[PDB]
Amino acid sequence: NEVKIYSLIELIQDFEMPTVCTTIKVSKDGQYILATGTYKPRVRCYDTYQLSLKFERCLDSEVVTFEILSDDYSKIVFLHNDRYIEFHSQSGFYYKTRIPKFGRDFSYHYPSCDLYFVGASSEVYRLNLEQGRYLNPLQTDAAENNVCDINSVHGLFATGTIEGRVECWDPRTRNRVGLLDCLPTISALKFNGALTMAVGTTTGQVLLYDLRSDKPLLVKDHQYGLPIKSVHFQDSLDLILSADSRIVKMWNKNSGKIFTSLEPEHDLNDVCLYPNSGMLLTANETPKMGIYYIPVLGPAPRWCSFLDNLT
Amino acid sequence: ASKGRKLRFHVLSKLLSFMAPIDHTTMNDDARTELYRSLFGQ
């Protein structure tokens, strides 16, 4: 328990939602950090170089999740609980359209310009971007589909189901390559590398899975029964990044030794890690958004280079 | 079909040419075909 964590004077001004923050995400270049919050659903982007918010754009409905299509802040897609997808260009709002059934989560395949809708229908909707026409439907034959992920290594699409069955599909030729069998619902599913996959369960168990072997490589159970919303992977220290609302746990991929655990004052909606840095950004059910810096995990980010002097 | 409950394939003008296809996959097409046949117990 010798990590001795810091908590943060003000790195970025007005890094505060009005009441709560649902999702926080970072652009691939790392210059833009995006966050959305209640009330009056906003899209607030903060400049790393300027340490200030570039703009705010209010929305009609609360956004369950948003994904950054472009390398810069230019192009963004929002999925709503009102079945609505809103497209925002660089200037502002660009186009809006609905889906027949509610969408739990969505993932975009950068190859083929195909964007996938996973939701409250057994069929998984597909969206082509280069061509406006909606593509052919694919039937996952399970009543409710909860989560989805696409692997960057070789383009594998897998969708979670309510029964607890993970179903893998092929983005090309639209065929179900295989099935994985494992009452608890699939809370979180992440692809890391070619052959490593993780499944979160509502009971609080995050399970490591390998593609070729049905049996799990390792099992880690959170003692608290709350579901694990988000799981991340850190390659440098081989750490698997597991977060639930009560607490977030840092543990090694092999042998499952625990690195450290962080419990904040109020629950975490979402957790994010800045690339190649020990700085951690967490979204809480609080107007302030958490910023935590772990020196042992990694060095300070470049736009916050002076923290290493301050420690 | 009310309120867009049924899927329709009419052309969407505003979304036309919204992105350009960019591909960065190292694995070659012959290697891709062999892997998918070999996936899981198959």
């Binding site: 026409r133 052919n136 030729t173 | 899927l7 329709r8 394939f9």
Partner: peptide
């Protein structure tokens, strides 16, 4: 026809 699904051919 509005509900007919288009078909593609592998190139």
């Amino acid at each position: 026809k509005a509900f007919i699904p288009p078909k593609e051919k592998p190139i």
